[PDB]
Amino acid sequence: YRSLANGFHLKANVVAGLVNWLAKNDSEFTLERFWQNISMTFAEEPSLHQLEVHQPLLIQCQKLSQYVLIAQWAELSEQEIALILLPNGIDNRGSAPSPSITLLKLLSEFKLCQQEAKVSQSELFDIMQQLITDTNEKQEKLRNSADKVIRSIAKSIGSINNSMDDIDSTISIRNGSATLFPPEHPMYKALKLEVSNLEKSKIQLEGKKKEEEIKLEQAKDNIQSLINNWDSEIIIRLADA
Amino acid sequence: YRSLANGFHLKANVVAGLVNWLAKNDSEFTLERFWQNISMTFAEEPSLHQLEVHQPLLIQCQKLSQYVLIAQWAELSEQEIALILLPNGIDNRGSA
Amino acid sequence: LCLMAKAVLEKEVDKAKTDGLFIRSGWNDLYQGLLAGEDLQLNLQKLENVWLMEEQRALEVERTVSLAQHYQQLSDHKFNLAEIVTGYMAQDKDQKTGNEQDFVELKNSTLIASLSIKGLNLVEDYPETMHLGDIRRIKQISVSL
Amino acid sequence: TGNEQDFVELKNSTLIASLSIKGLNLVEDYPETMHLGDIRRIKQISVSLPALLGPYQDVQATLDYAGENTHLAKGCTALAISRGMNDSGQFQLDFNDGKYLPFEGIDISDKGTLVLRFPNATSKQKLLLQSLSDIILHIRYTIRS
């Protein structure tokens, strides 16, 4: 996708949208099949007659260039393409509608929607995405991505408590192994520094723990409050936009 | 402050004035709490739904952007902000 | 290469200091991967500083443990080595194993004179009550016959 | 005990043959009335042992520095003995290396003691510590302006 995007004067996510767009209309096209058709020709001796023989590349590259012309005319962003690559999208037909006049005026009315709103357009794509989606996969997806960060913060505290227990055990061992040692600066003046330097590591691990506990509390507060999706707030967001 | 200032097209002392400005109004905001809320998300696998869950960042960043709009409209310098961050300032009310 | 350098410095320098070096990938797909070499340059400079600060002087020990300890070995299966290999010069494909750790056998005409490293007892040479040696690492093993 | 500076003791089976560096009197070798040597710095300390070891018996021994020194780099206070001949605490001792040496950078007129601890003499160090004439302690230091 990056090399096809830089071959034209395009962006990587726009080409990654357009190839997946063309992955549905004209289902003979596949990006794997496109790479296999590239690797069939361009051998140890490439030439122009090898392209004249292998006409599916001459179909597929012009087929790509048509959707590139449509994306340059309608001036599509990457999230504009990603909104139409939703599995039902505009709900007139399924995902990735074919390039007819119907699509090519749907994009015109879509650009009129982007002109009328006088707000940030990513707000419009989020509102339009909740109008396309169902607010049942979205809520469970937020719960999954919420329990993921609960799991990660709990795993970080469980991994730091092991190192704190290790440092505490080694300090207890080095305190238990110390005796009177009537040579003080020859022999006793090596365990005191070796304990006092690890005391600072204990203070640093407690300083990390006293903020990761705040991370747990803020997570468990911001995750036990995802209840209020009631489907009437989206038209309120439209009246805001 | 330097990385937030270079994230926008701002100066470092202007952002250091505006965060201390917002440290007083809406006392739930703290720069330490802002860094902790950044470090809660953006884990080994960050995504956009993790921001959709953690709505205090979505409050605090828009709250910062409001004072950025006020500082760009009034065209505040760093010592203009530092004069209003005096502990009584204009003496109509307290600081900030 | 940077991951090689990290995994090689984690041999000498312990893993309590090389933690936050190569956690994140410097590549950014949303841009064209710009400033990805700066992340590698910083994370090699920080690695090099970890190496130059926290590299310590080795304390070398040359220890000669001959195989006159099979007579000493475990006191339940002990044997004389020269006598038993004289016994193994004829009557092929036998075995008098000491243990599964220390033994002298031959499966084929090749004979095996095995020796456990824990049975060497090299941590008794520089024991406790003098405080040194968190880790003991073998540097080089040479053989005389 | 001779003194708290120079003594021979054993707290455990480990015996300690301590030795003060100020009691060595190395500033009398190149004295006044010839004008040189603002500072005298120890370059390298190697030990010889005129003991009998025979074919393959090893001596375990240490060396430590006792005084205060904020300039010994990392692990340069210690040195181990394994041969009995004129040896140091490095494999293939080389002065033309980028690293320092053990005991490198210690003044002559210091109040630190060279400790010279042997390990457990109740163990295999017996009959090795019996035949002990003395300890030679080849000292190589640097006089510089």
Residues 60-99 on C with a CB inside 8 Å of D are: 60-64, 66
Provide CB contacts within 8 A for A28, sequence distance 6+: none
How many Å lie between the alpha carbon of A11 and the closest alpha carbon of chain C?
9
Question: Which residues from chain D sit within 8 angstroms of residue A187, using beta carbons?
Answer: 64, 66, 115
**Cα dist. A171→A166, A181, A197, A203 in Å?**
9, 18, 10, 13
d(CA D103, CA C68): 37
Question: Which residues from chain D sit within 8 angstroms of residue A183, using beta carbons?
Answer: 4, 66
Contact A13 C30 (CB under 8 A): yes
Provide CB contacts within 8 A for B94, sequence distance 6+: B87, B88
Supply the DSSP symbol for B28.
T
d(CA B9, CA C132): 56
With beta carbons less than 8 A apart as the criterion, state whether D101 and D76 touch: yes
Q: With touching defined as 3+ CB pairs under 8 A, do chains B and D touch? A: no
Nearest residue on chain D to C53, judged by CA atoms?
Answer: D74
Chain B: partners with 3+ C-beta pairs within 8 Å: A
d(CA D42, CA D143): 9
Structure-derived torsion over alpha carbons of residues D24, D30, D31, D32, reported in degrees to the nearest 10: -160
d(CA A48, CA A41): 10
How many Å lie between the alpha carbon of C97 and the closest alpha carbon of chain D?
27
d(CA C75, CA C69): 10
Q: Is the dihedral of CA B61, B66, B70, B73 positive or negative?
A: positive
State whether residue C134 sits within 8 Å of chain A by CB: no
With beta carbons less than 8 A apart as the criterion, state whether C54 and C46 touch: no
A 10 A CB-CB count for C21 gives 19
d(CA A190, CA A171): 13
Q: Angle A134-A139-A140 (CA atoms, 0-180°, nearest 5)?
A: 110
Which of B40, B47, B55 is closest, CB to CB, to A145?
A: B47
Burial class (CB in 10 A: 0-12, 13-18, 19+), A35: exposed
**Cα dist. A230→A139, A140, A224 in Å?**
11, 14, 16
Question: Which residues from chain A sit within 8 angstroms of residue D7, using beta carbons?
Answer: none
With beta carbons less than 8 A apart as the criterion, state whether C6 and C21 touch: yes
With beta carbons less than 8 A apart as the criterion, state whether A174 and A195 touch: yes
Residue given tokens 């240490």 in the structure block: D62
How many Å lie between the alpha carbon of A9 and the closest alpha carbon of chain C?
13
Tokens (6 digits) for A104: 């090519």
With beta carbons less than 8 A apart as the criterion, state whether C58 and D75 touch: yes
Contact D120 C126 (CB under 8 A): no
Report the SS3 class of residue D61: strand
d(CA D114, CA D93): 21
d(CA C125, CA D59): 10
- The three state secondary structure string of chain A is CHHHHHHCCCCHHHHHHHHHHHCCCCCCCCHHHHHHHHHHCCCCCCCCHHHHHCHHHHHHHHHHHHHHHHHHHCCCCHHHHHHHCCCCCCCCCCCCCCCCHHHHHHHHHHHHHHHHCCCCHHHHHHHHHHHHCCCCHHHHHHHHHHHHHHHHHHHHHHHHHHHHHHHHHHHHHHHHCCCCCCCHHHHHCCHHHHHHHHHHHHHHHHHHHHHHHHHHHHHHHHHCCCCCCCCCHHHHHHHHC
Chain centre distance of CA C139: 8
- The three state secondary structure string of chain C is CHHHHHHHHHHHCCCCCCCCCCCCCCCCCCCCCCCHHHHHHHHHHHHHHHHHHCCCCCCCCCCCCCCCCCCCCCCCCCCCHHHHHHHHCCCCCCEECCCCCCCEEECCCCEEECCCCHHHCCCCCCCCCCCCCCCCCCCCCCCCC
Tokens (6 digits) for D106: 């210690």
Task: Give the residue from B40, B52, B54 with the most A CB atoms within 10 Å of its CB, the best one to mutate.
Answer: B40
Chain centre distance of CA A84: 18
**Cα dist. D94→A88, C12, C26, D44, D55 in Å?**
76, 22, 42, 11, 27
In 3D, which of C43, C23, B31 has the Cα closest to residue A156? C23
Which of A2, A12, A191 is closest, CB to CB, to C131?
A: A191
Residue given tokens 């006159």 in the structure block: C68
State whether residue D28 sits within 8 Å of chain A by CB: no
Burial class (CB in 10 A: 0-12, 13-18, 19+), D127: exposed
Tokens (6 digits) for C13: 């320098």
With beta carbons less than 8 A apart as the criterion, state whether D30 and D108 touch: no
Tokens (6 digits) for C58: 């080795």
d(CA A186, CA A188): 6
With beta carbons less than 8 A apart as the criterion, state whether D3 and D111 touch: no
Query: Bridge-partner residues for C121, per DSSP?
Result: none
Element (DSSP H or E) covering residue B81: helix B78-84
Which region, left, alpha or beta, applies to residue C63 given φ > 0 means left and ψ of -120 to 50 means alpha? beta
With beta carbons less than 8 A apart as the criterion, state whether B40 and A215 touch: yes
Which region, left, alpha or beta, applies to residue A24 given φ > 0 means left and ψ of -120 to 50 means alpha? alpha
Q: Angle C122-C123-C126 (CA atoms, 0-180°, nearest 5)?
A: 105
In 3D, which of A120, A115, A23 has the Cα closest to residue A67? A23
d(CA C131, CA C129): 6
d(CA C74, CA C121): 12
With beta carbons less than 8 A apart as the criterion, state whether C99 and C77 touch: yes
- The one-letter code for the residue type at D65 is Y
**Cα dist. D136→A40, D18, D23, D62, D104 in Å?**
80, 13, 15, 14, 19
Nearest residue on chain B to A211, judged by CA atoms?
Answer: B36
A 10 A CB-CB count for A95 gives 15
Method by which the model was determined: cryo-EM
d(CA D116, CA D31): 28
Supply the DSSP symbol for D11.
S
Contact C130 D119 (CB under 8 A): yes
Q: Is the dihedral of CA C86, C91, C92, C94 positive or negative?
A: negative
With beta carbons less than 8 A apart as the criterion, state whether C97 and C77 touch: yes
